[PDB]
């Protein structure tokens, strides 16, 4: 998911 | 409502880019052929314009005449009158040109002259003689 | 906050009754506005109570004890509310000191496939409700896609690594129950190019801005221009990005075209003037001779000869005037052309170096979703964004495995047991499972209901690894096929000396080509022991699984030598390389919203299965087959907590189905 | 065999 974006 | 500032996305462009598999890479190479053409297209006519500049070589320096340094006068000399009569023959109703030929008359004075001596210099005939050309 | 904060932490609107609350309390939500506010307070307060002390059970008796008037006057309500909250795992979930020891006898038999986080969470709950629960795990360990490498002092996660904010997160409760060393992640991530030289803050910030810009742009295509279908095929985020990039490269050229197109026009305007200027110099050259000759006629002269001099004079000075006025316009067009050629518009959209750095940013997004962007639904890839937790992200310094192992404790778990066939019918269920060690040896499990926590990629296997008898209805199997199941791998590199920047939690690596942009593109410095963790995402994910550990570890060192120095990088003492796609008990990393799928499929995954009747004409029976997992939850897919909440959810539904709902009567 | 927990 998006929330995983570094 | 609108795309991010500086992003350019028209409705029509999207359809044109997706028309087929590699339709977009054809559009992009098309503009590359366009730019290459327009780019050297400049040098060809840059060189032409440079060649035309070369025929103009020197400008109009030894052609400019001695200045018309003379003060205006209200008085009409007979000589001056005659100069005007001939100037209607050469220029017609171009009262500035006629005034410049005489050199010491203002445009208004030339128009004044035209009305008074319209009769005595048959200036109407002088005008129509000029008109025939 | 306070009582309102409790609702927030429990992912609930504090000033409003939810859809599930309307379902269970149809008297209150259809009732007068006063009753609702009483309900909402009791609900919010009870959550606060449990949240303030999550390590001990919160009973009805303890709840009513700590309620003020008029809220404690209706004790049937306080009981109803409490039971609802307890049933759906909003309170008394995880690991807590039980006040009333587990019910003397057990009601109903439940078999749970897999002891992953969802599986355990449902097991702990169904046991809390006094049901007979047995979990069947294929692996030789608990945790599933939560797996921690533990060897000596080296600790590193090959599975779940990050807690994505404690604000509203059910993991925040668990972190207070279990010993979790949660360390904050400093989001400062320096990038390094192929050669090993850092990326200047000039480039870094301008490319990253362009990345975020390109994304908003794709949204504009998706929502504003409805660019969601193309040739019957659904558009992927990967495609829309290319479209938007190309439209930007197009405009860069269109601006160049209309600029040179503007030079040629000024180039012409001069030519027309120059031709006029040449022809005038010709007539001035001629008219000068006529004047010159007329001037030779020395005075005294008659008036017509006089007039000729004066007349030729005027005619010539007038033409000199013109030429000076035309030379004026020449100078202006001449410097206007030096103006345009001095400063053109943008030369290119993105240089080779620019695009490579942008590709890294895509690799990030390919990792985030565990899939090449060419597969992600343009419309729905981010549908689960609104539900993101507040607060900064954290990692489990002692390894995430403390959580499964914690939850596992006290449960009948059968490790090394591979479920081969699930059979559900009117009167009940049987589970056909083999021992993973000796494969031709068999077990049979009889139960009232089955909770399936099989990873989507397992449910995807062709041929089927697990068989459903009867076959799952086409709606469920289409959900299984539409939905995406991604891949993401980790290289663990165990050193015994830190050669990297210790104050930096993570650093990127920029690949040479788009093809390999997700290959070892990111490194994590997270643990006590000098351990670096390398990510393999995007397309590289799947391809690297065919390459031996040594070659992979080799590439890692090489990259690291580039950044830190040819001799600063020793041979790692211990290495681990995950291969989730190849792993029979995951067959990938975690789900994603594929092109053609939507957020709705996630709901279809959670939807239970009711078998057909035994005797023809007999009544429609009870639901038998249930589904929990990270892929069964629309609002938190692909996450540990997401899985957790599905387990919590399903346990509730099953208990309601087999022990009856007291709180609705 | 393996050191995974
Ligand atoms: C590399 C990676 C990194 C991740 N990082 C994060 C992160 O930072 N944050 C986060 O929130 N989430 C993360 N996740 C996802 C998170 O770990 C999962 O979403 C969660 O563990 C899923 O739990 P589950 O119970 O739904 O599936 P699983 O945990 O896989 O549970 C399924 C269980 O069933 C077993 N099983 C499978 N087939 C059979 C069979 N035929 N018979 C019997 N048993 C079987 C499996 O062994 C497994 O134990 C990550 C995942 C991966 C792969």
Backbone dihedral angles phi then psi of residue C613, each to the nearest 5 degrees: -75, 155
Distance C144 CA to ligand 1 centre (A): 4
Alpha-carbon gap, residue C594 to C591, rounded angstroms: 9
Alpha-carbon gap, residue C577 to C552, rounded angstroms: 8
With tokens 């350019």, the residue in question is: B8
Alpha-carbon gap, residue C52 to C176, rounded angstroms: 10
Residue of C382, C389, C522 with shortest CB distance to A6: C522
Q: What is the DSSP string of C137-206?
A: -SSSSSBTT--EEEETTEEEESS--EE--SBT-HHHHHHHHTT--EEEP------B-TTSPBPPHHHHHH
* C143 contacts chain D (CB < 8 A): yes
Distance C319 CA to ligand 1 centre (A): 92
Backbone dihedral angles phi then psi of residue B73, each to the nearest 5 degrees: -140, 140
Domain with C652 in it: 109-234+351-665
Contact C312, C287 (CB under 8 A): yes
Q: Which helix (H) or strand (E) holds C429?
A: strand C428-435
For residue C126 the two structure tokens come to 């169904």
Residues in chain B: 133
Q: What is the DSSP string of B48-97?
A: HHHHHHHHTTTTTGGGPPPP------S---HHHHHHHHHHHHHHSS-HHH
What residue in C sits closest to B52 (Cα-Cα)? Answer: C274
Instruction: Answer yes or no: is C510 a known binding residue.
Output: no
CB-ligand 1 contact for C148 (6 Å cutoff):
no
Q: Final residue of a domain: which of C79, C108, C137?
A: C108
Residue ranges of the domains in chain B?
Answer: 1-133
Q: Final residue of a domain: which of C77, C108, C139?
A: C108
- Please state at what angle helix C237-296 crosses helix C303-342, rounded to 10 degrees: 160
Residue of C261, C271, C318 with shortest CB distance to B38: C261
Is residue C333 located within the same domain as residue C400? no
Cβ–Cβ below 8 Å for C384 and A2: yes
CB-ligand 1 contact for C588 (6 Å cutoff):
no
The residue whose CA has the least distance to atom 21 of ligand 1 is C145
With tokens 């054809």, the residue in question is: B26
Is residue C560 located within the same domain as residue C415? yes
- Geometric angle at alpha carbon C407, from C403 and C410, rounded to 5°: 150
CB-ligand 1 contact for C112 (6 Å cutoff):
no
The residue whose CA has the least distance to atom 4 of ligand 1 is C160
Q: Using only the alpha carbons of chain A, give its radius of gyration.
A: 4
Domain count, chain C: 3
Is residue C345 located within the same domain as residue C240? yes
Alpha-carbon gap, residue C536 to C364, rounded angstroms: 10
Is residue C396 located within the same domain as residue C325? no
The backbone region for C498, taken as left when phi is positive above 0, alpha when psi lies in -120 to 50, beta otherwise, is beta
Cβ–Cβ below 8 Å for C369 and A1: yes
- Tally helices (H) and strands (E) across chain D: 0, 0
What residue in C sits closest to B11 (Cα-Cα)? Answer: C225
- What residues pair up with C532 in beta bridges, in sequence order? C493, C525
Contact C379, C237 (CB under 8 A): no
Contact B11, C224 (CB under 8 A): no
Residues in chain D: 5
CA distance C398 to chain D (A): 12
Ligand 1 pocket check: which of C116, C162, C535, C642 to mutate, most ligand atoms within 8 Å of Cβ? Answer: C116
Is residue C209 located within the same domain as residue C255? no
C178: Cβ contacts below 8 Å, ≥ 6 apart: C94, C95, C402, C403, C406
Technique employed here was X-ray
What residue in C sits closest to B25 (Cα-Cα)? Answer: C246
Is residue C75 located within the same domain as residue C139? no
Distance A4 CA to ligand 1 centre (A): 16
Ligand 1 pocket check: which of C135, C136, C160, C518 to mutate, most ligand atoms within 8 Å of Cβ? Answer: C160
- B–C CB contacts, 8 A cutoff, strictly below: 138
Give D2's contacts in chain C (Cβ within 8 Å): 140
C223: Cβ contacts below 8 Å, ≥ 6 apart: C379
Please choose, from the candidates C492, C517, C493, C524, the residue with its C-alpha nearest in 3D space to the C-alpha of residue C189. C524
Q: Final residue of a domain: which of C350, C372, C393?
A: C350
Is residue C586 located within the same domain as residue C596? yes
Q: What is the DSSP string of C343-359?
A: S-S-S-SS-HHHHHHHH
* C116 contacts chain D (CB < 8 A): no
Resolution in A: 3.0
C121: Cβ contacts below 8 Å, ≥ 6 apart: C89, C93, C407, C628, C643, C644, C645, C646, C647, C648, C651
Is residue C531 located within the same domain as residue C655? yes
SS3 for C80-122 is: HHHHHHHHCCCCCCCCCECCCCCCCCCCCEEEEECCEHHHHHH
Is residue C417 located within the same domain as residue C461? yes
Q: Which domain CATH number covers C38? A: 1.10.10.10
Contact C255, B38 (CB under 8 A): no
Distance C145 CA to ligand 1 centre (A): 3
Instruction: Answer yes or no: is C581 a known binding residue.
Output: no
Distance C455 CA to ligand 1 centre (A): 7
Decide: helix, strand or coil at residue C594.
strand
Is residue C632 located within the same domain as residue C537? yes
Is residue C486 located within the same domain as residue C407? yes
Instruction: Answer yes or no: is C162 a known binding residue.
Output: yes
Instruction: Answer yes or no: is C139 a known binding residue.
Output: yes
Contact B122, B130 (CB under 8 A): no
For residue C530 the two structure tokens come to 């000098």
List the CATH code of the domain at B1-133. 1.20.58.1880
Residue of C143, C151, C405 with shortest CB distance to D3: C151
Instruction: Answer yes or no: is C639 a known binding residue.
Output: yes
Is residue C98 located within the same domain as residue C115? no
Alpha-carbon gap, residue C136 to C424, rounded angstroms: 17
Which atom of ligand 1 is found nearest the CA of C580? 53
């Amino acid at each position: 998911p998006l929330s995983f974006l570094v | 409502r609108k795309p991010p500032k500086g992003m350019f996305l028209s409705q029509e462009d999207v359809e044109a880019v997706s028309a087929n598999a590699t339709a977009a890479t054809t559009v992009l190479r098309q503009l590359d052929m366009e730019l290459v053409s327009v780019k050297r297209q400049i040098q060809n006519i840059k060189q032409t314009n440079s060649a035309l500049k070369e025929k103009l070589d020197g400008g109009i320096e030894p052609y400019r005449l001695p200045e018309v340094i003379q003060k205006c006068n209200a008085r009409w000399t007979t000589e001056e009158q005659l100069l005007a009569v001939q100037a209607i023959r050469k220029y017609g109703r171009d009262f500035q040109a006629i005034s410049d030929v005489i050199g010491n008359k203002s445009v208004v004075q030339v128009k004044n002259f035209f009305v008074n001596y319209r009769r005595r210099f048959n200036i109407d005939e002088v005008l129509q003689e000029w008109e025939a050309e | 906050s306070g009582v309102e904060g409790a609702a927030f932490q429990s992912r609930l609107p504090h000033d409003r009754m939810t859809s599930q609350e309307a379902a269970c309390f149809p008297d209150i939500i259809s009732g007068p506005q006063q009753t609702q506010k009483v309900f909402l307070f009791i609900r919010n307060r009870t959550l606060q109570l449990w949240l303030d002390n999550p390590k001990i059970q919160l009973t009805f008796e303890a709840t009513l004890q700590q309620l003020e008037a008029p809220y404690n006057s209706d004790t049937v309500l306080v009981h109803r509310v409490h039971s609802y909250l307890e049933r759906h795992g909003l309170i008394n979930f995880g690991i807590y000191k039980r006040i009333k020891p587990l019910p003397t006898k057990k009601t109903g038999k439940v078999i749970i496939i897999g002891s992953g986080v969802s599986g355990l969470a449902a097991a702990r709950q169904l046991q809390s409700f006094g049901m007979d629960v047995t979990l069947l795990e294929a692996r030789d360990r608990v945790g599933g896609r939560v797996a921690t490498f533990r060897k000596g002092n080296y600790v590193a996660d090959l599975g779940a690594m990050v807690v994505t904010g404690l604000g509203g997160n059910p993991m925040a409760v668990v972190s207070k129950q279990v010993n979790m060393e949660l360390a904050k992640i400093k989001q400062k991530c320096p990038l390094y190019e192929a050669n090993g030289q850092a990326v200047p803050k000039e480039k870094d910030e301008m490319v990253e801005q362009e990345f975020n810009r390109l994304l908003e742009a794709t949204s504009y295509l998706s929502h504003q221009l409805d660019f969601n279908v193309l040739n019957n095929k659904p558009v992927s985020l990967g495609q829309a990005l290319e479209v938007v990039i190309q439209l930007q490269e197009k405009h860069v050229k269109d601006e160049q075209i209309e600029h040179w197109k503007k030079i040629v026009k000024t180039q012409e305007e001069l030519k027309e003037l120059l031709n006029k200027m040449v022809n005038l110099k010709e007539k001035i050259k001629e008219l000068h001779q006529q004047y010159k000759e007329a001037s030779e006629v020395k005075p005294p002269r008659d008036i017509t000869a006089e007039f000729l001099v004066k007349s030729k004079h005027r005619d010539l000075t007038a033409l000199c005037k013109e030429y000076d006025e035309l030379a004026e316009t020449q100078g202006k067009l001449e410097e206007k052309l030096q103006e345009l050629e001095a400063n053109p518009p943008s030369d290119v959209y993105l240089s080779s170096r620019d695009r490579q750095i942008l590709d890294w940013h895509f690799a990030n997004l390919e990792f985030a979703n565990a899939t090449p962007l060419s597969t992600l639904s343009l419309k729905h890839w981010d549908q689960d964004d609104d539900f993101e937790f507040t607060g900064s992200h954290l990692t489990v310094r002692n390894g995430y495995s403390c959580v499964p192992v914690a939850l596992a404790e006290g449960l009948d778990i059968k490790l090394n047991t591979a479920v081969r066939q699930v059979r559900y019918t009117a009167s009940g269920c049987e589970v056909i499972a083999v021992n993973t060690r000796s494969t031709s040896q068999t077990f049979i499990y009889k139960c009232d209901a089955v909770l399936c926590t099989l990873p989507l990629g397992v449910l995807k296997q062709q041929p089927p690894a697990v068989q459903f008898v009867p076959p799952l209805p086409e709606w469920k199997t289409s959900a299984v096929q539409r939905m995406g199941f991604g891949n993401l791998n980790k290289v663990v590199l165990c050193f015994d000396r830190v050669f990297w920047d210790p104050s930096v939690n993570l650093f990127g690596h920029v690949g040479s080509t788009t093809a390999s942009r997700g290959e070892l593109f990111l490194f994590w410095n997270l643990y006590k022991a000098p351990i670096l963790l390398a990510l393999v995402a995007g397309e590289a994910a799947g391809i690297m699984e065919n390459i031996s550990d040594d070659v992979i570890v080799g590439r890692c060192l090489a990259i690291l030598k580039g950044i830190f120095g040819s001799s600063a990088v020793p041979q790692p003492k211990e290495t681990v390389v995950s291969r989730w796609r190849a792993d029979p008990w995951a067959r990938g990393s975690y789900s994603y919203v594929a092109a053609g799928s939507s957020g709705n499929d996630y709901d279809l995954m959670a939807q239970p299965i009711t078998p057909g009747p035994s005797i023809p004409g007999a009544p429609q029976p009870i639901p038998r087959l249930f589904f929990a997992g990270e892929h069964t939850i629309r609002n938190y897919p692909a996450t540990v907590h997401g899985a957790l909440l599905s387990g919590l959810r399903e346990a509730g539904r099953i208990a309601d189905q087999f022990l009856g709902a007291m709180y609705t009567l």
